[PDB]
Amino acid sequence: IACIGSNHFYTDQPEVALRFYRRLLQMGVYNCQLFNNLGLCCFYAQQYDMTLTSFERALSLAENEEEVADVWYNLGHVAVGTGDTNLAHQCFRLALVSNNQHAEAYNNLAVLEMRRGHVEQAKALLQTASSLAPHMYEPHFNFATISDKIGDLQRSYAAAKKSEAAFPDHVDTQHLIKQLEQHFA
Amino acid sequence: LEKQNWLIHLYYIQKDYEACKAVIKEQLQETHGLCEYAIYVQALIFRLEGNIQESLRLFQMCAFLSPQCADNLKQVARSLFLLGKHKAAIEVYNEAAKLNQKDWEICHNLGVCYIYLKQFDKAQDQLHNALHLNRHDLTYIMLGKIFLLKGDLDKAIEIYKKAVEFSPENTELLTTLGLLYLQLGIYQKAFEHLGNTLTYDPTNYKAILAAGSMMQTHGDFDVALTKYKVVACAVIESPPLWNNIGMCFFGKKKYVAAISCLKRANYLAPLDWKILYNLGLVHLTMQQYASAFHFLSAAINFQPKMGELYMLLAVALTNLEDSENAKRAYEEAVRLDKCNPLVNLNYAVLLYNQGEKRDALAQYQEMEKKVSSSLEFDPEMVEVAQKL
Amino acid sequence: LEEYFELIDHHFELRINGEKLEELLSERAVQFRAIQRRLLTRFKDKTPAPLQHLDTLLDGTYKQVIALADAVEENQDNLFQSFTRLKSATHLVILLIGLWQKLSADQIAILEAAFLPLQQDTQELGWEETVDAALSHLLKTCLSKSSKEQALNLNSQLGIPKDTSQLKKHITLFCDRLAKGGRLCLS
Amino acid sequence: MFREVLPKQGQLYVEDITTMVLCKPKLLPLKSLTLEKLEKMQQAAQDTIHQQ
Amino acid sequence: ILDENAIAQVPRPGTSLKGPSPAVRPVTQAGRPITGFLRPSTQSGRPGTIEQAIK
Amino acid sequence: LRFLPLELSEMEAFVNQHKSKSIRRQTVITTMTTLKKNLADEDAVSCLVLGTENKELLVLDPEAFTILAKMSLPSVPAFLEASGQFDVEFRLAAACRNGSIYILRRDSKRPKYCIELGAQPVGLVGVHKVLVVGSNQDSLHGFTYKGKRLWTVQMPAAILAMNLLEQHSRGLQAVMAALANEEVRIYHDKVLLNVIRTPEAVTSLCFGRYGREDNTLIMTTLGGGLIIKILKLNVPRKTRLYVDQTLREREAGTAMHRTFQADLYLLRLRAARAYVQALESSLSPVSREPLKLHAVVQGLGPTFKLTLHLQNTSTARPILGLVVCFLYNEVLYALPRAFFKVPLLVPGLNYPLETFVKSLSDKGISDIIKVLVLREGQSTPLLSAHINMPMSEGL
C-alpha cells in the first residue's frame, strides 16, 4: 500500500495516493510518517480542509528531531505553495533548527533568500546543501545558475558539471554547460 | 627550446590529457623551461577544462616573458573576467589597449565588463567603438542587452534590425528580435522572424515557446498544441511549456486536462506567479471558489502590484460568503488597475447585487472612462447600464 | 622579517614531510588490505594449498606500516613544537610592528586575529593557508588601490600551498604598505 | 440576477528564464515491524542503563 | 566492500542488483529514488570505497 | 640567444638589458593544401591553402604575392586537416576538436557540417571514396563525401591512428587500426583478424611495399623503433476519485475555504511560536551578524572526528572576535579542548575546525553534543548546533 501510494503520488496522481494512505489510516496505523504523507496528499490532491490538521498530528507524533524537521520542511512546502514566502522561510529555518544536516531546507531557504535579494546568503546556503548531499542536483544547479548570473564561470562550470553528475538527463544543466564551454573559446 | 614540437600536441588534439600532460613534465625538464608552447598548452588547455586558475597563472607567466605583447595581456584580463573580477579585467584590458589601439576584442570585452559593473555610458560607448572597428554579432547582442536593461525597446529594435540585416542566419538575433516584437504591439513581424528562425531550426525550444504563445493569444489552440508537441520530449519537465499547454487545454473547454497540466507545472515551480494565477482562474471557471482563492492569494503574494489578481480574488470571494473582503479587494484592484474595464464592471456587479445601486453607477462610469472585444463583457456592460 | 621567515619555512617543511609520510602510509595500508583479502580468500577455501609466502609479504607490509605510523607520530610532534615556536615568533613580530609604527589597540587586535589563527595544525586547516587568506584579504580591502593586483596576487584560498613564497611576499608587502602610511580597517 | 464575468484568457509565458529551483516535498517513508522492534530494543537498553 | 561473492564482475545490465526522474521524486543517491516502507534489509545503493562509506 | 644549448642560469640576466628586436613570420603549421596539375615545375602553382595550429588555413598565391583567403570557421584545432592531403571531389574534410567533422570545401566554399559523432575524432585518412575517422565512444565512422554514414565499425577501446591501403576495387583492402592500450587491430570492415600488442603510440601507418609485391605494412612507434610486423502526449488521466472529489469541492467549497484559512492562521501562529522559541534558545545554525555553522561527525569506533564547518556570509566584512564552546556530558565524551578561538573569518571561505571526541562509556550510550559560537564580549551564543553522537562500537 505504501509503495503503490508513493508511486501514485509522484506520478502526478495525488488523489489515488491519498486514497491508498487513507486506507492505512483506516487500519489503525498511527505514525508521524503516515500523517505527514496524508497532509502532502491532501494538499496536492486539493483537499484543503484535511491538509494542515494532518501536519499537526504529524508534528505531534514525531519521536525524533529529524521527523520534526521533515514535517516542518513539508509545512514550508505547503506555505510556499500558498504564497506568503515568510511562513515558508520560518518553516525552512525551523527544519534547519531541528536537523542541522537537512540539505533540502538549505536549498529552499537559499532559493527564498535569492528571491529576496541576498545573493551571498543564498550562495553560502547552497554550498552547505551541496556539501551535505552531493547526490542531489538542485543545490549544484542553483549555485551554477547564480554564479553564471553574476559571472565566475569557473564556479559555474564546477557546479553544473556536478549537477550533470547528479541528474545526468537534466535539460537546463546541458544548456548551461553548452554556454560555458562556448564562453571558454 | 621545443624539440618535440607536436609530440605534446598530439595527445592534446585527441584530448588524451595524460601523455600530453605527463610529457610536459618531461619535455619541460629536458628543455629546462623557456619552451613557450608547453606552458601555452597548459594555459589555453587548462581554460578548456573547468580550471581557470592555472590558466591565469600560466598567462601571467606568458605576460612576464613578453611584457610588451597585447595578446598576453588580453588573455590575462580574459582569465580574470572568467572569474568574478571585472574591474581588474578592465584595468588589464586598458594596458592591452595602450599597446594595440586597433582591435575589436578589447572594446567588446570592456563593454561586457562595464555591463557587469552597471556603468552603462562607458559600456555603450565602448561597444559602439567595438562595432566601428569590426562589427560582430556578440557586440550587437550586448548593445541590445544594454538598451533593454537601461531603457526601452524603442532603442533596441533599431539595433536588432541592423544586426539581423547582415548575417541573418543567427538564430539568437532573429529570435530575440521576434521576442522584442512580441513585447510591443506588433504581432506580424514577430511571427515573420519566428518563422524565419524555425525554417533554420525546426525544433528551437525558445522560439517554439513564443510561437505557441502568440498562437494561443489569437485563438486556434490546436496549432499551438501541435507546436508544443514538437518539443514536448526535448523538455519534458519545464514549467513554462506545461503552463502554456494547460492554457491550451483551458481554451478548448478541457478544464480538467488543464488543471492537470497547470498543477504539474506548479509543482515544478511553486514560486511562479503565472501558473498560480492560471490555476486560480481555472478554478474560478470550474466554480470551485475554495481553491481559486488559495491560488490567487498565492499569486498575489508573489506579484502584488497587479489589478486582475485582486479582481479575481474578489470575484471568487463574493462566492465564499465574505463580502467585506471582496469590497476591500475590489478597492485595491481599482486603485491598482488602469487599463482593464473588467475590474470596474465586476465591481459594479458586486455593488448592484449588494442592493446599493449608487456606487455601481460610479464603477460603471469608471469603466466607460477606461474604454472592447470580449463577447460576454459586452452584454453585462449593457445590462448593468439599462438596469441602473 | 628575515629570522621570522625561517621559522615559517621550517614549519612548512615539516608540513610537507607529514603529507608525504601520510600519502606513503596510504599505499602501505592498501597493500596490507590487498594481501589480507588474498589470505582471507585462501582461508575460506576448503582445499589445501601452499601459502606461496603470502604470509611473508603480509609481515613485510605490516613492518612497513608500523614504521610509517611511528614516523607520522614523530612528525606530528615535531610539527607541534614548530607551531608553538612559530606562535612565539609571530607574537614578537606583531609586537615589533605595533611599536615600529604607532599602532593603536584596534589595529593590534586585527593583526593578532590575522596572524595568530589557530593553536594546532590539522589535516584540513593549517597556519599557512589561514594567515595567507587573512593577509591577502587585509591587503585587498584596506591597503591596495589597483584592481589588477587585487585580482592577480591578492586572492585567498584555504588549500595547503606548494610553496611559502606567496605568504612571505604578502607579509613583506604588508609591512611595506604600512611604512608608507597605510592603515587597517574592517569594512 | 447578474453573474460576474471572468476573463477567458490566462497568462502565458513568452520566454523561459532560469529560476532557482526548490527542493521537492518529501514523503516520510514508513517503517517495518522488525525495524521498529530493533530500534525499541536498542533504546530500552539505554533506558535501563540510565535507570540503574 | 571487503567481501566479494558475486561470480560475475560486470554482468549484463538487468541481471544484477549492484521511473520518475529526480525532477519529481526526491532521491537518496545518484539514482535510487526514495522508497516507501523502509525495511531493515534496505541497502539502497552501495559505496565504492571504505573512505567514501566512512566520510 | 636562448634556443637549446646554453647556460640555464648565468646568461638570463643579460636578456633584459639587451632586448634586440625580432621579426615575424607565418605561425606554426601542421598540414597544407597545394595544387597537383602544374606540379612538376614547382613555380606555376596557384593556390597554397595551409593549415596552422590556430585553425588558420592561409591561402597564399605566388602569382601576386598575396593572401587570398583564410579558413578560420572551425576556430578549433584540426588533427589532420585534409583527410589525406586532398579529396578527388575536393570536399575537404577539416576535423574539429569538439566532436564534429566539416565538409568545408577546397578554396573555402560553403560549409556542410556533420556533428554526428559521440565524441572527438582521433585520426583521419581517406581513400578518395570514404571518410574513415576515429572516435572516443569505442567505434569508428565511415562517412561519404556528403555526410551520410556508409559504415561504422565497433572496436573495444579508443583508437589512435588508422589508414586504408591502395584501392584495387573501390576501396577493398585491410585497415591498420591501433588502440590506446598498446594494441593493434586489423580488419576487413566486416571480418576480424588481429589483436596483439606492439605500439605504445604511433604516428602514421603507410605502405612499406618493396619488390613490386602486393602490400607491406609499416608501423612507427614512439619508443624509437620502426616496426614492420605482419600477423500523443503524456497528459495524465483522472479516475472516479477525481470527479467525486471535484463534486465535493463544488458542493462544499465554502467550508473547505474557511477551515483551510483557520488552519493557515493556526499554522502561522505555531510557526511564529517555534521561531521565537528558537531565537530564545539560539538553536539556529544559520543566524547584520552574518554566520553559518554546521557540525559533521566522522568515524566509527571510540574516537570520532568532529569537524565544524563555519562560514562568514557577507559581502566584504570579516568577523574578528568569535569563539566556540562545546557542551557535552563529561562522563560519556572526553573532549580535549572544549573551548577555542576561531580564526579571522574571511567572507566566503568555509573553515573546517575539527576536534576529536572520544566515547568513555563501556556500554553503548549515544548522547547529544551542543556547540555554541559566541562573541568574546557577550555571553549569549551567536548561534548553536547539535550533533547526535553515534554508538561507540568500543572494546
**Whether residue F263 is found in the same domain as residue F295:** no
Closest approach of chain D CAs to the CA of E35, in angstroms?
6
CA distance F133 to B178: 40
Q: Is residue F37 part of a domain?
A: yes
CA distance F106 to C4: 67
CA distance B335 to F220: 84
Cβ within 8 Å of F, A 110-129 = 120-121, 123-125, 127-128
| E26 at interface of D, judged by CB pairs closer than 8 A | yes
**Whether residue F226 is found in the same domain as residue F237:** no
3-state percent breakdown (helix, strand, coil) of chain E, nearest 5: 10, 5, 85
Asked whether at least 3 C-beta pairs link C and B within 8 Å, the reply is yes
Q: What Å distances lie between residue F111 and B37, B224, F106, F135, CA to CA?
A: 31, 34, 10, 22
Cell of B16: 588524451
Q: Is residue F20 part of a domain?
A: no
Name the phi and psi angles at F150, rounded to 5: -75, -50
Cβ pair D38:E40 closer than 8 A? yes
Neighbours of chain A (3+ CB pairs under 8 A): B, D, E, F
Cβ within 8 Å of D, F 307-366 = 363-366
Cβ-based contacts of B19 with chain F (< 8 Å): 201
| B190 at interface of D, judged by CB pairs closer than 8 A | no
Interface test with E, best of A66, A74, A135 (most E CBs within 10 A): A135
CA-wise closest residue to D29 among E38, C45, E25, A131? E38
Cβ pair A15:F296 closer than 8 A? no
The set of residues, in sequence order, having a beta carbon less than 8 Å from that of C72 and lying 6+ positions away, is C18, C21, C22, C25
Q: Is residue F98 part of a domain?
A: yes
Residue ranges of alpha helices (H) inside A1-137 are 2-10, 14-26, 33-44, 52-61, 66-82, 85-98, 103-116, 119-132
Interface test with A, best of D18, D19, D20 (most A CBs within 10 A): D20
**Helices and strands, number each (H, E), in chain F:** 3, 22
**Whether residue F104 is found in the same domain as residue F192:** yes
CA distance C63 to B267: 60
Q: Is residue F84 part of a domain?
A: yes
**Whether residue F81 is found in the same domain as residue F224:** yes
The set of residues, in sequence order, having a beta carbon less than 8 Å from that of F5 and lying 6+ positions away, is none
**Whether residue F118 is found in the same domain as residue F178:** yes
Question: Å resolution of this model?
Answer: 3.4
Q: Are E45 and E52 in contact (CB under 8 A)?
A: no
CA distance B313 to B384: 21
Q: Between D20, D29, D31, which is nearest A142 by CB?
A: D20
Interface test with E, best of D26, D32, D33 (most E CBs within 10 A): D32
CA distance A164 to A172: 10
Q: How far apart are the first and last CA of chain A?
A: 54
Distance of CA F366 to the CA centre of its chain: 43
**Residues C91, C93, C99, C102: is their CA dihedral positive or negative?**
negative
Helix pair B256-267, B239-251: axis angle to 10 deg: 170
| B266 at interface of A, judged by CB pairs closer than 8 A | yes
- Residue F125's CB is within 10 A of a number of other CB atoms, namely 21
Question: If DSSP codes are grouped into helix, strand and coil, which group holds residue F270?
Answer: helix
Cell of A115: 528571491
Q: Which residues of C touch F (CB under 8 A)?
A: 109-110, 113-114, 117-119, 122, 124-125, 130, 133-134, 137, 141, 156-158, 186-187
The C-alpha cell 596576487 sits at C153
Cβ-based contacts of B267 with chain A (< 8 Å): 12, 44
Cβ-based contacts of C114 with chain F (< 8 Å): 344
Cβ pair B52:A48 closer than 8 A? no
The set of residues, in sequence order, having a beta carbon less than 8 Å from that of F176 and lying 6+ positions away, is F162, F163, F184, F186, F205, F217, F219
The CA-based angle F274-F280-F284, given to 5 degrees, is 70
Q: Which helix (H) or strand (E) holds B167?
A: none
Cβ-based contacts of C162 with chain B (< 8 Å): none
Q: Which helix (H) or strand (E) holds B74?
A: helix B70-82
Experimental method: cryo-EM
**Whether residue F182 is found in the same domain as residue F250:** no
| D49 at interface of F, judged by CB pairs closer than 8 A | yes
Closest approach of chain D CAs to the CA of B206, in angstroms?
7
Q: Please count the CA atoms within 13 angstroms of the CA of F116 that sit on its side-chain side.
A: 13
Cell of B357: 445601486
**Closest CA in chain D for residue E37:** D30
Q: Which helix (H) or strand (E) holds F232?
A: none
Q: Between F260, F275, F314, which is nearest A90 by CB?
A: F275
Q: Is residue F55 part of a domain?
A: yes
Q: Is residue F151 part of a domain?
A: yes
Q: Between A12, A135, A169, which is nearest E28 by CB?
A: A135
Longest Cα separation, chain B:
100
Cβ-based contacts of F8 with chain B (< 8 Å): 32
Cβ-based contacts of E51 with chain F (< 8 Å): none
Domain interval for residue F273: 232-287
**Whether residue F203 is found in the same domain as residue F132:** yes
The string of DSSP codes covering F310-351 is EE--SSS--B-SEEEEEE--TTTB--S-SEEE---B-TT-EE
| C148 at interface of B, judged by CB pairs closer than 8 A | yes
Question: If DSSP codes are grouped into helix, strand and coil, which group holds residue F150?
Answer: strand
Q: Are F333 and F367 in contact (CB under 8 A)?
A: yes
**Whether residue F186 is found in the same domain as residue F259:** no
How many independent structural domains does chain F possess? 3
CA-wise closest residue to A54 among B288, F259, B298? F259
Per-domain boundaries in chain C: 1-187
Q: Between A103, A105, A111, which is nearest D20 by CB?
A: A111
Q: What Å distances lie between residue F178 and B250, B282, F156, F162, CA to CA?
A: 61, 65, 11, 7
Asked whether at least 3 C-beta pairs link A and B within 8 Å, the reply is yes
Cell of C115: 596572524
CA distance C128 to D5: 72
Q: Which helix (H) or strand (E) holds B206?
A: helix B205-217
Cell of B339: 487599463
Q: Between B84, B290, B300, which is nearest A150 by CB?
A: B84
Asked whether at least 3 C-beta pairs link D and C within 8 Å, the reply is no
The set of residues, in sequence order, having a beta carbon less than 8 Å from that of B4 and lying 6+ positions away, is B23, B27
Q: Which residues of E touch F (CB under 8 A)?
A: 54-55
Torsion angle of C-alpha atoms F342, F347, F350, F351, degrees rounded to 10? -20
Q: What is the DSSP letter of F97?
A: T
Q: Which residues of B touch E (CB under 8 A)?
A: 236-237, 267-268
Burial (CB count within 10 angstroms: exposed 0-12, middle 13-18, buried 19+), residue F383: buried
- Residue B315's CB is within 10 A of a number of other CB atoms, namely 31
Asked whether at least 3 C-beta pairs link D and E within 8 Å, the reply is yes
Cell of B290: 475554495
Closest approach of chain E CAs to the CA of B151, in angstroms?
37
Cell of B33: 623551461
Cβ pair D31:E37 closer than 8 A? yes
CA distance B107 to B90: 10
